[PDB]
Every structure is written in structure tokens, then in C-alpha cells.
Amino acid sequence: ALARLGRALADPTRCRILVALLDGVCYPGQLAAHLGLTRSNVSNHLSCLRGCGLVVATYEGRQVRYALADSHLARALGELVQVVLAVDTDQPCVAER
Amino acid sequence: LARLGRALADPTRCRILVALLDGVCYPGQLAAHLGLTRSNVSNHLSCLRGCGLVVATYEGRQVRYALADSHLARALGELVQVVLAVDTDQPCVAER
Ligand SMILES: [Cd+2]
Numbered sequence: 195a196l197a198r199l200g201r202a203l204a205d206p207t208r209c210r211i212l213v214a215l216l217d218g219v220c221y222p223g224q225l226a227a228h229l230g231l232t233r234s235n236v237s238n239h240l241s242c243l244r245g246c247g248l249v250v251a252t253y254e255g256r257q258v259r260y261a262l263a264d265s266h267l268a269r270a271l272g273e274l275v276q277v278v279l280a281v282d283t284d285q286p287c288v289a290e291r
Numbered sequence: 292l293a294r295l296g297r298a299l300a301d302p303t304r305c306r307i308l309v310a311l312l313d314g315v316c317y318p319g320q321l322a323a324h325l326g327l328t329r330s331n332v333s334n335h336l337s338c339l340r341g342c343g344l345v346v347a348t349y350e351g352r353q354v355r356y357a358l359a360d361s362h363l364a365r366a367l368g369e370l371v372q373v374v375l376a377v378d379t380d381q382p383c384v385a386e387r
């Protein structure tokens with residue numbers, strides 16, 4: 195849903211998760227190598243992401259994995275949102291302000 | 292990031308931004324594209340300009356409103372693949 199999709203995709207670590215899952219889908223905490231952040235730290239944000247649907251927790255040839263929800267997010271994130279790659283930044287809100 | 296996708300995943304603003312693409316004519320022309328009042332639709336632009344997602348221009352006779360760049364017109368215009376985001380009754384938290 196719109197008010198889940200946008201809050202989970204426009205987030206510091208979760209944008210970084212979702213794009214590193216594209217080149218990942220290994221094991222629980224594998225994103226720690228992709229991000230440099232602890233396997234504790236990165237898994238915290240997945241406890242939102244699996245509820246927002248955006249990641250699907252699966253099994254592979256020997257262990258459990260976290261994949262993007264479908265080809266859907268793997269494609270639309272893989273074009274890149276084009277906004278220079280959204281990062282956290284000190285820019286304000288409201289027009290003319 | 293946190294200005295971008297808060298204004299990009301909003302009820303009327305996703306609707307503005309996709310209707311701007313097929314419009315960019317005049318202030319409140321979006322009222323025809325959305326079926327919503329020219330005041331009501333313009334209220335949301337008072338965020339959208341500050342969030343950087345829209346820029347005001349001039350054309351051959353009046354002022355216009357356009358998407359920030361080709362950047363948002365392309366990534367919106369592929370379609371974000373999420374079935375077209377609309378307000379929908381779906382929850383949060385994993386395993387819950
Ligand atoms: Cd969530």
C-alpha cells in the first residue's frame with residue numbers, strides 16, 4: 195500500500211537493503227557485508243520490510259534467504275529512481291520556505 | 292530521501308505528478324485530470340515545490356507547473372511496478 199511502500203522505500207538503510215538484495219539474496223544478515231553495518235542493525239529494518247511485503251523470506255539449496263517481493267521492485271529499483279540516488283540530506287519542506 | 296518519497300507516496304501528490312506528465316499547462320489544469328477542486332489539488336503543490344518534485348515555469352501566455360526533470364517523468368513513467376500505488380488498507384511489522 196502507498197503509505198507503507200513509500201515509508202519503507204524512502205528510508206536510510208531500507209533503500210540500501212532493497213538495492214543490495216538485488217545483488218544479494220544470500221542468507222540472514224548477509225547484507226552486513228554489502229552495507230558494512232552489523233547483522234543486528236540491518237535485520238532490524240527487515241522486521242518492517244517483510245511486513246510492508248517488500249521482502250519475501252524463502253529457502254534456497256542449503257539455508258533461508260531474503261529476496262525482493264518480486265521482479266516488480268528488482269526492475270523499478272534497477273532502473274534507479276533517477277533522483278541522483280536518494281540519500282538522507284538536510285533539505286526542508288513547504289514551498290517558498 | 293525523506294522529502295522525496297513522503298511526497299512521492301502521497302494520495303493526491305502521486306496523482307498530481309503523473310497528471311503533470313500528460314499536462315504541464317496551467318495552475319489548476321490538474322483539476323480536470325484528477326476530478327478534484329483547483330484549490331484542493333493546489334494545496335498539495337505547496338509541499339511538492341519545496342520537496343523539489345515540481346518547478347514553476349512560464350510558457351507562451353501564462354505560468355505552468357512541471358516535474359523537476361526528465362528524471363522523475365521517466366521513473367514515474369515506467370511505472371513503479373507496485374500495481375500503481377493507491378491508498379490501500381495494508382499493515383506493517385513482519386510476522387504480525
Ligand atoms: Cd513495515
Ligand SMILES: [Cd+2]
Nearest residue numbers: 287288338342
Ligand atoms: Cd514538501
